[model samples]
Target: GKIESYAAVNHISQLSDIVLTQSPASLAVSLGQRATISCKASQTLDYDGGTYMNWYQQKPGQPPKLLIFAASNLESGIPARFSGSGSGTDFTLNIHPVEEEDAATYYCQQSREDLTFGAGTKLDLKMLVESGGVLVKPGGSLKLSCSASGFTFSRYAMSWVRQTPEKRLEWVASISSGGSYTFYPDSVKGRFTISRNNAKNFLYLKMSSLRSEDTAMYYCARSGNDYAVDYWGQGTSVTVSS
Candidate 1:
């Protein structure tokens, strides 16, 4: 979460472009075993003296927590068992002895291009969500889409969440698993709409009369019974230009 905020504040998206794909789509291992996750970028992430890649973990209902930075460096206070290495197009995050508590989705993000994240490597995972980045002019309308796979789309609701440049994580809206209802937060009530196409396994967030304040990374997540988010999209970076 902190690293995400830092990345946002620094405007990492300005760095340039690449698409990241994480392997092992899902990993299952016993406790105290090594868990290796691989993230391959469409292009080299090495630039300006750093690999420009970072890693994060997301457990249910929680914001993504930063685990590694600059490809091979661990974040402060992260367990020593958690480590990162590699460079260029290939990078790896290793949990030497994955603790019981370490079971969650791990993702890699690259600052080199449009600020994109991997599809996610779940350490005992479920559904997977995917999206991209978009740039829109102020006062214009925007429609961001998220694609879901690995599960029955109609059986679980989908929610939209966003991380503002200020580092705040806000819930934008949610559509019922049955696709019969929709909900929204007061902040976006009037200008936002949430919809889904179960047949296509896609969720959408539409915003009208956008402003600079709306610029942030918008994520689509799968909601469990209690409406808590379990799986999340790589996130679509919405740039409402000033």
Candidate 2:
């Protein structure tokens, strides 16, 4: 009978280059004229003040829900402009006068890493017109995916994180990519690699030095903290166009 989880070490030597990539917009300005959508983090995230920058809302199949927490404290009911401020490593998740189910797709999670995600910021529905794009075409070759829609993508094992708008959240390897079994750490071997395909439920990530800062919008996560993402998808958009 030993079930005690909640250990706080707190070292975080340095983290706050701030790299967050999100896209999906539509604001014509009329009913109030004030709509902003951008939550970028690649560096700043070494919290000390309160610590709990959260925000979630994944629609398009549906699963993730929890507006904003701690850092700005608005978790109960959530609707007042959907505000949150920047603390330690910089943060901001504001949504005011923006409705229509808030559009969809918006995630910024940092419970100091047991559950960290912020490669999502999609909000579009002004009639909708191909809303969702994040390109990374410099050297070319970037394949990102995060699939686990209903669980059993081979006993869980999918991680590849890099929030390098400057450099803060970079673990970059741990794959079961569907039972191919790969665990990288030797400073991102060669370039990067991870794959999986348990028939259909996928998990893959392939990066080959394609700079432009590697664009962003890459998530294929599953670790812990019990926030429960049991299965997360709808995050796949890699561009390093020709």
Candidate 3:
């Protein structure tokens, strides 16, 4: 009987060890606007009400930063502007009077049998862009490009974020296609640039560096700041070969 009970718990874990989650696949807003980002699980998530759901806001060139944990608790230094609610499969990442720095990919992770995250929601700036896949040798210069259309390239800023094969996403840089302002992570400040051809509506990510650690899926997104990249481009994959 004891073995059978243990087996049942294990069985549940096996069937749903990893949960599926969804949100508005894209988000778009203006400064001082109010909007709530929804995070929903495919199935029930409960423990009291449901397994705790954590929220994150990841920008270009850096790791996904934790915003909220266990549904309502704010992570250290997280602004009061962010909050979350919802139990079970229906969870929410709420942002009030959305700030410019608060726009980026929002992800929700749950703690039940193990750790699992949702398919991230992209903040669509205006249109979409993509990059060509590249295979590069170690110690070689790598230039990853992202081109977008349909919107005036100078009206809004954009960003570049990379996600590793290990599923770690990092923020890299943010810049205006017009080259008006630019930013890069401290780790990559010396090695990357936000270059573009405004006449071509082409935004480029130029990384004059690489290592095995630099390999990952690189993305270009419409940015509010490092705090958020509103909408994302279909990611371009990078492989580091020796």
* Best TM-score among the predictions, by candidate number: 1
Off by over 4 Å in 1: 1-16, 125-206, 209-242
TM-score of each: 0.51, 0.27, 0.48
Candidate 3 accuracy as TM-score: 0.48
- List where candidate 3 sits over 4 angstroms from the true fold: 1-16, 48-50, 124-242
Q: Which of candidates 1 and 2 reaches a greater lDDT?
A: 1
Report model 2's TM-score to 2 decimal places: 0.27
**Model 2 scores what on Cα lDDT?**
0.55
The candidate, 2 or 3, that scores higher on TM-score is 3
* Candidate 2: tens digits of C-alpha lDDT, residues 79-169: 7887878766667777777777677767777645444566676666555543235665677666667656655556555566554432223
lDDT of 3 at 89: 78
The better candidate by TM-score, 1 or 3, is 1
* Runs with alpha carbons beyond 4 Å of true place in candidate 2: 1-11, 14-47, 56-70, 73-80, 83-98, 118-190, 193-206, 209-236, 239-242
Q: Give the alpha carbon lDDT tens digit for every residue of 1-242 in model 3.
A: 11111101111211225465556777887777666778777666666543567777876544567787667777778888888888777888878767777768878765443335677876534254533268888777777677777776665566677777655556676664456556665767887887767677777887766777788888776632222333567777888777
